[PDB]
Amino acid sequence: SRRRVVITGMGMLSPLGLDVPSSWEGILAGRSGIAPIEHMDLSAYSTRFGGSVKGFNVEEYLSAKEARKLDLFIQYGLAASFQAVRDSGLEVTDANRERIGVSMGSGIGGLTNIENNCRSLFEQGPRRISPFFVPGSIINMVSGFLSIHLGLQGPNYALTTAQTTGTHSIGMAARNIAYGEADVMVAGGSEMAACGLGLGGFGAARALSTRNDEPTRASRPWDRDRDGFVLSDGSGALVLEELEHARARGARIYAELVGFGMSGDAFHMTAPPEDGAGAARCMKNALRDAGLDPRQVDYINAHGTSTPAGDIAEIAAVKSVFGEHAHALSMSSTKSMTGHLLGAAGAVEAIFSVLALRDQVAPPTINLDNPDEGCDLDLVAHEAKPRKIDVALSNSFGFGGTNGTLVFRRFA
């Protein structure tokens, strides 16, 4: 048998806001976080816009000296994690610290730091590389620094599954709790790939929208005029907690995490199969894990990247899984507003899925002006849709054909 897992704390940096409530207010208002990138010369570049975190103050969390040791993606992960642990009210003690762990991941990790240290290395040789280069750049240092700061002695690890990172991180943390390896996990992801290497790297693969004239219309999932994803920065963290542990301390419980699915497409390094076969197996795995019939799903937070092939595969996968229920559920891409946070996408989208349950509202797919061929589902075009939501899925489908699905349910 298996223990139940609930969400008792959430934390976020996104292009819409420096916490969950500010971000969620923007999501329900259909506001875009996408703008031309600043203090960084994107002249030789075909994409000059994205989703930046605006006005982040790391000294609310860390001393300036400790912050100087850490890449932005680690700072962002620690901010979301500290927010989530505060939001949970949990008190870490000698009696429970071995039962509290961390799984915060990243898809690309410390590109800004690597870039800045390449500058030193090429211009002056190795003796100018920062002594903190390695520990301040490696993906597991959000989990590492958080564990050291809060005294967490539970399972300590980090996933890196590209654009699926946040989803897998939360799912595998839920497994730790369900199977009794921890009572509490801080789980999610962070990303800051807006450097020459990130915009250049995706740009060289012609993966990005080049809609420089209208950055806020660039992210348009399922719209016939879409032309690739929008690169975005930030972090999401959830406090996952065993149910009896949450009830014993009088925790506020947002939602229950009832299902986790994983699959591999085994198809292509970057492109999904046209029919979304692996995304369909992953959703069916998640529903089987939750003991739920596809008919019980009310809301899907899509991967919805605004790539031609990705968006159409997800429609095919939902029609395949849900059959005569596929039009009854609501499915929206919050990437229409946030852009694509890569490894943090799944983390912030799990939070939006939990808030859809709390507030009984499907967030919009903004910019869905002209649905493409076959995109005839309820994709919540333009404006938020109050409706009944008992069961909410969050999907992530990333490079290497790696898929994740989380199933959340209302808790009462």
Ligand X SMILES: NC(=O)C1CCN(CCc2ccccc2)CC1
Coil/strand/helix, residue 203: helix
Block residue for tokens 């980090």: 158
Q: Does the footprint of ligand X cover residue 169 (CB under 6 A)?
A: no
Residue 22 binds which entry of ligand X, a second copy, none, with Cβ cut-offs from 5 to 8 Å by kind?
A: ligand X
Question: According to the binding rule CB under 6 A, does residue 18 interact with ligand X?
Answer: yes
Cα separation of 364 and 260, whole Å?
24
Give the shortest CB-74-to-ligand X separation in angstroms: 15
Our CB check for ligand X shows the closer of 84 and 375 to be 84
| Smaller CB separation from a second copy, 298 or 314 | 314
What's the Rg (C-alpha) of the chain? Answer: 20
Torsions phi, psi of 169, nearest 5?
A: -60, -50
Q: How buried is residue 386: exposed, middle or buried, by Cβ count under 10 Å (0-12/13-18/19+)?
A: exposed
Tell me which of ligand X, a second copy, none is bound by residue 60, counting a contact when its beta carbon lies within the kind-specific cut-off of 5 to 8 angstroms.
ligand X
**Least distance (Å) from ligand X to the CB of residue 19?**
4
Find the shortest distance in angstroms from Cβ 61 to ligand X.
5
Quick one: 95 or 269, whose CB is closer to a second copy?
A: 269
- Residue 398 C-beta: closest distance to a second copy, Å: 7
How far CA 74 is from CA of 115, 167, 245, 251, 385, in Å, comes to 15, 18, 29, 28, 35
**Reduced to 3 states, what is the DSSP secondary structure of residue 330?**
strand
Which residues fall within 8 angstroms of residue 134, CB to CB, at 6 or more apart?
A: none
Which of residues 18 and 193 has its CB atom nearest to ligand X in the complex?
Answer: 18
Q: Closest distance between ligand X and the C-beta of residue 21, in Å?
A: 8
- Residues 343, 348, 353, 354, CA torsion sign: positive
Candidate segments 65-73, 79-87, 248-256, 325-333, binder of ligand X by CB under 6 A: 79-87
Cα separation of 101 and 32, whole Å?
34
Q: Residue 352 is encoded by which pair of tokens? A: 């939006």
Q: With binding defined as CB under 6 A, does residue 56 bind ligand X? A: no
Q: What is the DSSP letter of 87?
A: H
* Selected binder of ligand X within 2, 25, 68, 86 (CB under 6 A): 86
Asked if 340 contacts 163 with a C-beta cutoff of 8 angstroms, the reply is yes
Q: Considering beta carbons, is residue 363 or 398 the nearer one to a second copy?
A: 398
Least distance (Å) between residue 79 CB and ligand X: 7
219 binds, among a second copy, ligand X, none (CB under 5 to 8 A by kind): none
Least separation in angstroms between residue 327's CB and a second copy is 28
Question: Interface residues with ligand X (CB under 6 A)?
Answer: 18-19, 22, 60-61, 82-83, 86
